[PDB]
Amino acid sequence: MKTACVTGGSGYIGSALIKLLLEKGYAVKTTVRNPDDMEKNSHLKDLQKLGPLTVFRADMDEEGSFDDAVAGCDYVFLVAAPLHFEAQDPEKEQIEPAIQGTLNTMRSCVKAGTVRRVILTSSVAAVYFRPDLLGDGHGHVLDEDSWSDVDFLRAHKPPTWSHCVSKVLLEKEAGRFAEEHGISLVTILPVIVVGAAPAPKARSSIVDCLSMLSGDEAGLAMLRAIQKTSGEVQLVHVDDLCRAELFLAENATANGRYICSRYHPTLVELATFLAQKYPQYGVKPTDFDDEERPRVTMSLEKLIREGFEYKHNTLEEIYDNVVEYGKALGILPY
Amino acid sequence: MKTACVTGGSGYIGSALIKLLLEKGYAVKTTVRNPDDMEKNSHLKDLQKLGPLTVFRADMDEEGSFDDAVAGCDYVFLVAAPLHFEAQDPEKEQIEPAIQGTLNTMRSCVKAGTVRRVILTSSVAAVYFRPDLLGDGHGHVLDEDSWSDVDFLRAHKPPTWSHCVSKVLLEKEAGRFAEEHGISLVTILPVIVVGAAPAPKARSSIVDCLSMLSGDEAGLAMLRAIQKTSGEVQLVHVDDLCRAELFLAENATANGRYICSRYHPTLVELATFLAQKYPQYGVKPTDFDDEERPRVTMSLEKLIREGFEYKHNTLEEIYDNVVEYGKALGILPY
Ligand SMILES: O=C1C[C@@H](c2ccc(O)cc2)Oc2cc(O)cc(O)c21
Ligand SMILES: O=C1C[C@@H](c2ccc(O)cc2)Oc2cc(O)cc(O)c21
């Protein structure tokens, strides 16, 4: 029986990974910042009903705190924490702590001497910010060779520049570190993630995809900004993301970084689908009518080439269970 | 040096296949119904400059005429192109000749004794007609397991029913014949094909993708019909189709049938692109506004996970050279 560690077990993606690992016969260790907070971590008790699940305390700013959690693990899933709130000095407050915290966990992985592979969950924040491709007014198909432009982001500091710079640098630093220390590191890069997970206090990762239904002003702004940039948005079901992370840990030939994406609708298509299937929220699809814009899209083909198969392939399947989750979280009123 | 036969050398797809094969170092044999008609075959003289190209007279409707062209070949590219003349009895004027013409050439392949693989060019006409799915209000991703409903098509005879039936039945029959004689048959299923080819008298294969520029009422009706059915159209560059045919010929593990597609725009996306890239034609994108419909799309992934790579990936790249071809053919008035 193989053993896996999932960092950030209180979070959206972390909780979904733990569920899949248990269902697949793994013994799981997970880290949280306060194991006694059973309002935040009640799902970890439920999940113990599926297989061996051990909870540990750990924090990214606390050097070595991940030692006991990763020890004995065949695979380690590093789920990066979402930034959450802005900062006066993003370099000192966000970017640098993101690098350091990632290395901190890397070190606990070498020290375990048992980790066959580390799967880093990042996002396409590290892929898409290309001043040439986004700005030249032509369509483009990006892939895993594309990296967000750190120099341009620091020069002009557009909104979310710090989320993108921190993802790029922490991935590069973790790769540099995995090189010098002989540990296999594979990175996955999700688009907007959709679907239910066990975590009771998730939100950040769910606001964008439900914002047409909720009216969340920040969410809608984000979807519109992505569409203004790229001509569309990109979505993937959380269960396919989780299956992809498992796939990448278990298949020895997997190497480097992988975009994880399945459906790329315009907002009017998405709004139209949501209005038809969930009319109780009064979505007006004409609120998202827009000129057709050049499409700048992230290719999904690398994961496909390696033999992975997505299970949520239509728009409706990608949204198959997220609405009931938004209800339970209070993101939606009913 | 391997040798290959390409049927329908005066045709759009046949001529582009010959070009690719010569460039890639094959000796090539091709068939045309009248090797003298230089209206139709002037390109063959030109193509002979690229490598060893030999021309034969043959006719689908004439048993054995393909024997000479196919002899000695390692690969045969069965480009089933010419259909019929919609008469009172499509089952005897179109469907049956299509089947028998295909089996005619397959027999030459058996007689040759040398043929390691036959690549049949069909179309997603043999894939998409799924009345159990086209009106159910949901999206669907169809793949190579989906076949057009021949029974339903014969029962209700919607427009172009016999076209779809011809394609389904000749593919079924050719595969049955191939299995009986232990010959390798692989079928490729293009969507709408875009791009220049050597053939100086092609037309029907290019009218549709040029129809918003030419205003061809038949082409435009076809496009609107596809979009009312599937909520989008699907396009592929002729050069990727030819490279995919060669890929399927050369890759031993290739097996069965393969959708070939790369871009799936709405008509309003396509018209916006064309209007901006080619304003001299007067396209009005609002002529193609339409409500969003559930998407019924053909999966591209079988070819992808077998190792093939498309080179024309954006909408602009798929349209990189067809307008000049259209001007040359007279499809476009200027
Ligand atoms: O920087 C990114 C990545 C980007 C993205 C997603 C999908 C897509 O198709 C293109 C870009 O989305 C985001 C969404 C957020 O709430 C915050 C972010 O920082 C970002
Ligand atoms: O539905 C069809 C049928 C096919 C076709 C063309 C001509 C004809 O006479 C019959 C069928 O062309 C297509 C091309 C597409 O990208 C998507 C489609 O859905 C289709």
- Cα dist from A292 to A267, A268, A333, B228, B320, whole Å: 11, 11, 33, 19, 19
Report the C-alpha gap between B84 and A278 in whole angstroms. Answer: 48
How was this structure determined? It was done by X-ray
What are the φ/ψ torsions at residue A127 (nearest 5 degrees)?
-115, -45
Q: Which residue of B has its CA nearest to A308?
A: B305
Annotated resolution, angstroms = 2.0
Give the helix/strand (H/E) hosting B175.
Answer: helix B161-180
> How do the domains of chain B map onto residue ranges?
3-329
CA quadruple B262, B264, B269, B270: dihedral sign: positive
Amino acid identity, residue A273? F
Least CB-CB distance to B269: which of A272, A292, A301? A292
Instruction: Indicate whether residue B209 lines ligand 2 (CB < 6 A).
Output: no
Q: Is B60 annotated as a binding residue?
A: yes
Report the C-alpha gap between B25 and B3 in whole angstroms. Answer: 9
Contacts of B294 (CB under 8 A, 6+ apart): A273, B137, B138, B139, B140, B231
Taking the CA of B160 as reference, the closest ligand is 2
Nearest chain A Cα distance for residue B274, angstroms: 12
- With 0-12 CB in 10 A as exposed, 13-18 as middle and 19+ as buried, what is B291? exposed
- Looking from the CA of A178 toward its CB, the CA atoms found within 13 Å total 24
Among A128, A147, A148, A293, name the best residue to mutate to test ligand 1's pocket (greatest count of ligand atoms within 8 A of Cβ). Answer: A128
Q: Which residues pair with B310 in a beta bridge?
A: none
What the block records as the tokens of A174 is 């973790």
Amino acid identity, residue B107? R
**Does the beta-carbon distance from B139 to A314 stay under 8 Å?**
yes
Of residues A78, A73, A254, the one with CA closest to residue A174: A78
3-state secondary structure of A31: strand
Report the C-alpha gap between A37 and B144 in whole angstroms. Answer: 51
- With 0-12 CB in 10 A as exposed, 13-18 as middle and 19+ as buried, what is A7? buried
Q: At what angle do helices A204-214 and A217-230 cross, to 10 degrees?
A: 90
Euclidean distance between the first and the last CA atom of chain A, given in angstroms as a whole number: 42
Superfamily for the A3-329 domain:
NAD(P)-binding Rossmann-like Domain (3.40.50.720)
The rounded Å distance from CA B88 to ligand 2 centre is: 23
Nearest chain B Cα distance for residue A228, angstroms: 15
Report the C-alpha gap between A40 and A31 in whole angstroms. Answer: 13
Taking the CA of B128 as reference, the closest ligand is 2
Instruction: Indicate whether residue B205 lines ligand 2 (CB < 6 A).
Output: no
Of residues A222, A220, A192, the one with CA closest to residue A322: A192
8-state DSSP, A6: E
The rounded Å distance from CA A188 to ligand 1 centre is: 14
What the block records as the tokens of B332 is 């476009």
Instruction: Indicate whether residue B233 lines ligand 2 (CB < 6 A).
Output: yes
Report the C-alpha gap between B164 and B127 in whole angstroms. Answer: 9
Of residues B1, B21, B33, B22, the one with CA closest to residue B77: B21
Atom of ligand 2 nearest to the CA of B235: 16
Among A226, A262, A293, name the best residue to mutate to test ligand 1's pocket (greatest count of ligand atoms within 8 A of Cβ). Answer: A226
Contacts of B139 (CB under 8 A, 6+ apart): A314, A315, A316, B231, B294, B295, B296, B297
3-state secondary structure of A117: strand
Nearest chain B Cα distance for residue A256, angstroms: 18
Least CB-CB distance to B305: which of A140, A291, A307? A307
- Is B186 in contact with B258 (CB distance < 8 Å)? yes
Among B192, B241, B315, name the best residue to mutate to test ligand 2's pocket (greatest count of ligand atoms within 8 A of Cβ). Answer: B192
Look-up of token digits 């790029």: A168
Report the C-alpha gap between A147 and A141 in whole angstroms. Answer: 13
